[PDB]
């Protein structure tokens, strides 16, 4: 006795940074082969409402000389779902629903390097945020220290402010003042501290992927999934999917 929400999140990032493994780990909350194609997961998970949860899985990136023709086919797939869901508003005859194959989320996996973003990433994410809400996230956050992730949270945050990275939630959207709030306290995670979960309570050897003080990963979840998630998607349709039909 309950309606079905889609919801689409991509994960992307650089080549061995947990991607594939939080994608499981986010799912089993409810050896992984090297990625070499983009595959699709869809799970339906009941939080009273059920959802129906699809996570994109990416083949990493910045392992080759030239890198242009790794962030071309990220951007072929986000605009073939932008592609996909135009032809069904244009098509008259259509008396049904229209699924909603679009990626409404997108988390990109930054490498605890401990310093400034690296020109690529920089670069990366500006494209994405273009044309999709992203969310930033240091990748393998177990790797760092507790003094060091503080640090290099400021230090991204500074980058994404000084390359004007928009990143969700944008601050030219908050509506009121309980707005504001509550999306200030996802800026100030940004970017989010996760961990992988390996094997199994979801551990690393230990550390507890969902526990709030070890790692961000239990936050990022929920907000994402209940908190934040219809916000998302309203974002994702009136402002980033309009500017690709007016494009088009
Ligand atoms: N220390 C640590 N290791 C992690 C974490 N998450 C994943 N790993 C390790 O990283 C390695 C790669 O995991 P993987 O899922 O392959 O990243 P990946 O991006 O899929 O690799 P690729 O798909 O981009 S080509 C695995 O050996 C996994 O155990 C994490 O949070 N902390
Ligand atoms: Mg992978």
């Not at 959802?51 to 072929?76: A, S």
């Not at 999709?132 to 996230?137: D, H, L, R, Y």
């Not at 990275?165 to 940004?190: A, C, G, H, T």
């Amino acid at each position: 006795m309950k309606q079905g929400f889609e919801f689409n999140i991509m994960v992307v990032g650089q080549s061995g940074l947990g991607k594939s493994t939080l994608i499981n780990t986010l799912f089993k909350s409810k050896r992984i082969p090297k990625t070499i194609e983009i595959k699709s997961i869809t799970h339906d998970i009941e939080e009273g409402v059920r959802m129906k949860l699809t996570v994109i899985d990416t083949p990493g990136f910045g392992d080759h000389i030239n890198n242009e023709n790794c962030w071309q086919p990220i951007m072929k797939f986000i605009n073939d779902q932008y592609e996909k869901y135009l032809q069904e508003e244009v098509n008259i005859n259509r008396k049904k629903r229209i699924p909603d194959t679009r990626v409404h989320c997108c988390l990109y996996f930054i490498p605890a390097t401990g310093h400034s973003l690296r020109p690529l990433d920089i670069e990366f994410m500006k494209r994405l945020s273009k044309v999709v809400n992203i969310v930033p996230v240091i990748a393998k956050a177990d790797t760092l220290t507790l003094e060091e992730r503080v640090h290099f949270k400021q230090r991204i945050t500074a980058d994404l402010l000084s390359n004007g990275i928009d990143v969700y939630p944008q601050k030219e959207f908050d509506e009121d003042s309980e707005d504001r709030l509550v999306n200030e306290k996802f800026r100030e995670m940004i970017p989010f501290a996760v961990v992988g979960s390996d094997h199994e309570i979801l551990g690393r050897k230990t550390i507890e992927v969902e526990n709030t003080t070890h790692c961000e990963f239990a936050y990022l979840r929920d907000l994402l999934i209940r908190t934040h998630m219809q916000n998302i998607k309203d974002i994702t349709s009136s402002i980033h999917f309009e500017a690709y039909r007016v494009k088009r």
